[PDB]
Amino acid sequence: DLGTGLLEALLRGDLAGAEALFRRGLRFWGPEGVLEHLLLPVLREVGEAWARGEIGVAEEHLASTFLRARLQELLDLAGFPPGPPVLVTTPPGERHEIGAMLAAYHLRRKGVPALYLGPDTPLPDLRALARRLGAGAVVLSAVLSEPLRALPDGALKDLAPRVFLGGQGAGPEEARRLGAEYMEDLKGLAEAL
């Protein structure tokens, strides 16, 4: 019920209602749970409604901007330990950022200093920041497959000592082609580190 209620509140511009329903989900499912059982299903349904032609981009934007804000709050409430950061972003041309934010969140919740950069970072710039910050790892979220298919073989090799790639747009073959370690589960990311 909270998912439908939340989507409906957003689609009618009822931010207060949407906030109350999100907080309810947080209290019931917990931090990781609200993301899996509320934030993610609502975003999926928004995307499907858009793809079906039922809503425009403005409705989609409204819901995503709201949910991004909520996730950013949770991100900031997680610990940020000292020590070599893990840089988190998306490939050049990838502007879906919530998957990356989720990765940063799960890492921080497990005591890893994940620096979320925002999406869509050119690889030379990403490499330079990693080298300058002594980053132990880089993590990339790919929602679309096209930004990965545009990259040359081995492009993600050595962005940092460890490079992880995951998301709906990514598969093990593409990761291998690009020279990244493929990760299927957000919970396996912390383990790998």
Contact call for residues 24 and 2 (beta carbons, < 8 A): yes
Q: Which residues are registered as beta bridge partners of 98?
A: none
Dist CA 165 CA 142 (whole Å): 7
Render 36-63 in DSSP notation, one character per residue.
IIIIHHHHHHHHHHHHTTSS-HHHHHHH
Binding segment (CB under 6 A) for ligand B12, from list 20-28, 89-97, 109-117, 124-132: 89-97
Any idea what DSSP says for residue 36? I
- Residue 95: count other Cβ atoms within 10 Å of its Cβ: 11
> Which one of residues 4, 44, 51, 118 is an interface residue with a copy of itself (CB under 8 A)?
118
Interface residues for ligand B12 in 166-185 (CB under 6 A)? 166-168, 183, 185
Name, in order, each residue with C-beta under 8 angstroms of 68's C-beta and a sequence gap of 6 or more.
97, 98, 101
- Asked if residue 87 lies in contact with residue 126, where contact means CB atoms within 8 angstroms, the answer is yes
- Site string (77-96) toward a copy of itself, x via CB under 8 A: xxxxxxx-x-x-x-----x-
Which is nearer to ligand B12, 68 or 110 (by Cβ)? 68
> Residue 181 binds what, of ligand B12, a copy of itself, none (CB under 5 to 8 Å, by partner type)?
none
Residue 110 binding result from a copy of itself, ligand B12, none, given CB thresholds of 5 to 8 Å by partner type: a copy of itself
Q: Give the Cα separation of 13 and 7 in Å (integer).
A: 10
31 binds ligand B12 (CB under 6 A): no
| Whether 22 contacts 41, CB under 8 Å | no
State which residue, 7 or 189, has the beta carbon closest to ligand B12.
189
Q: Does 93 bind ligand B12 (CB under 6 A)?
A: yes
Give me the residues that bind a copy of itself (CB under 8 A), please. Answer: 11-13, 15-16, 19, 23-24, 26-31, 33, 37, 56-59, 61-62, 64-65, 68-69, 72-74, 76-83, 85, 87, 89, 95, 108-113, 115-122, 124-126, 128-129, 132-133
